[PDB]
């Protein structure tokens, strides 16, 4: 029992909005939607300490003689985990999947965005309705990839002109809909791994092709 998927639904909704914003040049870090890490960066945690410059009664003693592990090495080096696999193949998988969605179809994203109109005021209300129709078929794999390019493009629709006041809210909507709706079906129908094997393609750049031509069927037969 060691599952959780903490940076698999949120980190993903933000990796798609940032990747798209890159095509335009904007950056996701430019906004952040947070408070400079920590509570709100109150200038009093690191790079300042709370000691004047001497205060006897503390000549850097703190023991300084631990048994290597535990005390020094432990808690800051021991414990081998590597942070497991947070996604990686899943991220690049959505990247190439976006190119396979902006070639045919045409409609679909134009209708969803038509029933929403992202702007100063909108929220997860209307976005939850249209998105509902998207997964109303049963959370299909093609419905998840299309849902990434739908909320993604909509995000750049506001940040494209320096209007991230609503782009952050867009990432929050896809986050609750990807962990409380697309997650249960993503595991009940295989898992983010199998889906990566479906569309998430590393970069074979071959696909049973890319080799001159060989012989469609012999010219002389």
From Swiss-Prot:
Keyword Ubl conjugation (UniProt): yes
Protein source organism: Homo sapiens
Name of this protein: Bcl-2-like protein 1
NCBIfam families on file: bcl-2
Entry remark concerning the domains of this protein: The BH4 motif is required for anti-apoptotic activity. The BH1 and BH2 motifs are required for both heterodimerization with other Bcl-2 family members and for repression of cell death. The loop between motifs BH4 and BH3 is required for the interaction with NLRP1.
GO molecular function: BH3 domain binding; channel activity; identical protein binding; protein kinase binding
Post-translational modification: Proteolytically cleaved by caspases during apoptosis. The cleaved protein, lacking the BH4 motif, has pro-apoptotic activity. Phosphorylated on Ser-66 by CDK1. This phosphorylation is partial in normal mitotic cells, but complete in G2-arrested cells upon DNA-damage, thus promoting subsequent apoptosis probably by triggering caspases-mediated proteolysis. Phosphorylated by PLK3, leading to regulate the G2 checkpoint and progression to cytokinesis during mitosis. Phosphorylation at Ser-53 appears during the S phase and G2, disappears rapidly in early mitosis during prometaphase, metaphase and early anaphase, and re-appears during telophase and cytokinesis.
Site positions for Cleavage: 65-66
Source taxon at top rank: Eukaryota
Function: Potent inhibitor of cell death. Inhibits activation of caspases. Appears to regulate cell death by blocking the voltage-dependent anion channel (VDAC) by binding to it and preventing the release of the caspase activator, CYC1, from the mitochondrial membrane. Also acts as a regulator of G2 checkpoint and progression to cytokinesis during mitosis.
UniProt effect for mutating residue 160 to A: No effect on caspase-1 cleavage
Listed SMART domains: BCL (SM00337), BH4 (SM00265)
Gene Ontology CC terms, in alphabetical order: Bcl-2 family protein complex; centrosome; cytoplasm; cytosol; endoplasmic reticulum; mitochondrial inner membrane; mitochondrial matrix; mitochondrial outer membrane
Span of the annotated motif BH3: 90-104
InterPro entries: Apop_reg_BclX, Bcl-2-like_sf, Bcl-2_BH1-3, Bcl-2_fam, Bcl2-like, Bcl2/BclX, Bcl2_BH1_motif_CS, Bcl2_BH2_motif_CS
Cited Pfam families: Bcl-2, BH4
UniProt modified residues of type Phosphoserine: 53, 66
Chain residue ranges for the region called Disordered: 32-75
Single GO BP term: negative regulation of anoikis
